[PDB]
Structures are given as structure tokens and as C-alpha cells.
């Protein structure tokens, strides 16, 4: 209608290949297979037993086209710290969401401290259901907005500090309007 | 190893 996608993990061809740090043991690609046997590309991490997690994942460079304000819609699922057996003084039920404004569409290592926190993201009231045949993923849907943006594009980062989290859909868009 | 993995449903 008047929404215009700059990124939709769901419609991407082949692996996302986003940058994770650490590269292994932190955030990792996981395909959920839908009814026609086509992967939904997720990122997940569940090191709830180990202390001081600090796992980063960043998208590829995303252009803002003309837009000063963009909307980020995350479809996630958390596992409660209650539900996982075992002791866990550092378990979490949120992740952090950051953005970084850049004119360069090929930065290799962006420092954590150039990143600008948009919000801490928890399972709140809002959800979506996605019918994938054998199951219906009930997921949280959060939406945040950011701006005003001025540089050509930007990067999104997701920080985990000890949650059991599956990021199922990341959509970015602006309103043509 | 992740403690659990979501493949449409959690799975620990």
C-alpha cells in the first residue's frame, strides 16, 4: 500500500551470511523447513548455561533510499528461563537492538561502540502466528522506528547477553508517504 | 552447543 521494504530476511535467496561475532558458538543460521520444504532463515543463540554472553549479529548494509524514518519489525521467539532446567544466574529474556549509520556499504568490522541502541526487546503482549504446515509458529512481533536518518544507509545489530532466542523474521521498511 | 533449537517448535 504505502510500505516499502528495504530488507526482508524471509524473501532472501540462499543463506543470509550476516556477520556474527563471535563467528562460532554465538549467533548461528538455522533453517526452519515449511510445508513446501523451503527454508525460513533464522538466527538463534542459546548459551544460557555460560556466563557473560556478549554475542553480536549484524545485517548487511541496508540503504534508506529517500527515507528519514524506517520501521523495523522483528518476529522472534524466546524460551523462558523458567522452562530450561539447570542453574543460570545470568539467563535473560531480552536482546538488544542497535543501528549504525554509514555511507559505506562494505564495512568488515564495525566496533560495538559505534552502535546506537534503539531498544531492549522483550516478549511483550504482541504476537503473530505463522502457519508452516505441521506447526503454527506463534511468535512475538515487535516493531520499532528510527530516525531521522541522514547517511546513505545503515546496519542493524542484535546483541544477545544470555537469552535463548530465535529471530525468525526481520523486515525493514519505510512509509512512502 | 545451544541448549535448545527452534525448528518450528522448541527442542531442548
Q: Do B8 and A134 touch (CB under 8 A)?
A: yes
Say yes or no: domain A1-177 is CATH 2.60.120.260.
yes
Choosing among A32, A82, A134, which should be mutated to test the B contact, i.e. which has the most B CBs within 10 A?
A: A32
Method: X-ray
The resolution, in Å, is 2.4
Which residues of B fall within a CB distance of 8 Å from A47? 2-3
State how far the Cα of A30 lies from the Cα of B1, in Å rounded to an integer. 13
B4 interfacial to chain A (CB closer than 8 Å): yes
**DSSP letters for chain A:** --EEEEEEGGG-SS----EEESSSSSSEEEEEE-TTS-EEEEEEE---SSSS--EEEEPPPEE-TT-S-EEEEEEEEE--TTTS-S--TT-BSEEEEEEEEES-TT-S---GGG-EEEEEEE--S-EEEEE-SS-EEEEEEEEEEE----SSEEEEEEEESSB-EEEEEEEEEEE--
State how far the Cα of A16 lies from the Cα of A10, in Å rounded to an integer. 10
Distances (CA, A) of A34 to A10, A37, A38, A77: 12, 5, 6, 17
**Domain chopping of chain A, boundaries:** 1-177
State how far the Cα of A13 lies from the Cα of A29, in Å rounded to an integer. 14
Match 548461528 to its residue by C-alpha cell.
A28
State how far the Cα of A155 lies from the Cα of A157, in Å rounded to an integer. 7
Q: Grid coordinates representing A143? A: 516493531
Q: Please, which residues have CB within 8 angstroms of residue A109's CB and are 6 or more apart in sequence?
A: A21
State how far the Cα of A15 lies from the Cα of A48, in Å rounded to an integer. 26
Check: CB of residue A146 under 8 Å from CB of residue A72: yes
State how far the Cα of A72 lies from the Cα of A119, in Å rounded to an integer. 11
B11 interfacial to chain A (CB closer than 8 Å): no
Amino acid at each position: 500500500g504505502n510500505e516499502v521494504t528495504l530488507l526482508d530476511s524471509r524473501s532472501v535467496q540462499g543463506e543470509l551470511g550476516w556477520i556474527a561475532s563471535p563467528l562460532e558458538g554465538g549467533w548461528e543460521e538455522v533453517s526452519i523447513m515449511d510445508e513446501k520444504n523451503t527454508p525460513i532463515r533464522t538466527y538463534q543463540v542459546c548459551n544460557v548455561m555460560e556466563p557473560s554472553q556478549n554475542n553480536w549479529l549484524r545485517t548487511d548494509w541496508i540503504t534508506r533510499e529517500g527515507a528519514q524514518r524506517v520501521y523495523i519489525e522483528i518476529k522472534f521467539t524466546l524460551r523462558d528461563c523458567n522452562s530450561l532446567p539447570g542453574v543460570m544466574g545470568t539467563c535473560k529474556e531480552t536482546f538488544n537492538l542497535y543501528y549504525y549509520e554509514s555511507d559505506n556499504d562494505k564495512e568488515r568490522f564495525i566496533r560495538e561502540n559505534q552502535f546506537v541502541k534503539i531498544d531492549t526487546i522483550a516478549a511483550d503482549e504482541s504476537f503473530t502466528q505463522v502457519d508452516i504446515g505441521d506447526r503454527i509458529m506463534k511468535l512475538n512481533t515487535e516493531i520499532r522506528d528510527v530516525g531521522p536518518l541522514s547517511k546513505k544507509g545503515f546496519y542493524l545489530a542484535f546483541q544477545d547477553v544470555g537469552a535463548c532466542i530465535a529471530l525468525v523474521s526481520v523486515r525493514v521498511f519505510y512509509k512512502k508517504a | 552447543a545451544p541448549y535448545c533449537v527452534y525448528r518450528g517448535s522448541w527442542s531442548c
